[PDB]
Amino acid sequence: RARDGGLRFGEMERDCQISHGAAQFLRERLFEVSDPYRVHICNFCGLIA
DNA sequence: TAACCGCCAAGGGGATTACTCCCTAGTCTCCAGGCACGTGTTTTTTTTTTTTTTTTTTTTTTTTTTTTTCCTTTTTTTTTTTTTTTT
Ligand SMILES: [Zn+2]
């Protein structure tokens, strides 16, 4: 709380959300509101360009 | 005390001569086990793959949340400047 940190979306949260089977909440909590990024990738090599 | 010698007596069987006979020496003639040559099938050796247990390695240990405390080098060797003594 002193560093103003968010809650821990742990393993069993992903387990019970897979049990509910709603993919959009998983895509929100684990990609949209945690650490989104955009990278550019070469098509032939498949690595970071 | 009976070995040994001398003397005498008796008899038993090996040597001798002749007749016989029969078994083997010798000589063909057929054929068959004895032997020279080739080889085997068990016996030992060597590989080969597995087995079975032991040892080693590696990975694991429910989740979330909130406060402090200590530390986040250190000695040890080398260098470089400074100070003092001498001619
Ligand atoms: Zn490329």
From Swiss-Prot:
It is found in: Nucleus. This is DNA-directed RNA polymerase II subunit RPB2. The lineage of its organism: Eukaryota, Metazoa, Ecdysozoa, Arthropoda, Hexapoda. Zn(2+) binds at residues 42, 45. DNA-dependent RNA polymerase catalyzes the transcription of DNA into RNA using the four ribonucleoside triphosphates as substrates. Second largest component of RNA polymerase II which synthesizes mRNA precursors and many functional non-coding RNAs. Proposed to contribute to the polymerase catalytic activity and forms the polymerase active center together with the largest subunit. Pol II is the central component of the basal RNA polymerase II transcription machinery. It is composed of mobile elements that move relative to each other. Belongs to the RNA polymerase beta chain family. The gene is Polr2B. Component of the RNA polymerase II (Pol II) complex consisting of 12 subunits. It comes from the Eukaryota. The binding of ribonucleoside triphosphate to the RNA polymerase II transcribing complex probably involves a two-step mechanism. The initial binding seems to occur at the entry (E) site and involves a magnesium ion coordinated by three conserved aspartate residues of the two largest RNA Pol II subunits. The chain holds residues 1080 to 1128 of 1176 of the full protein.
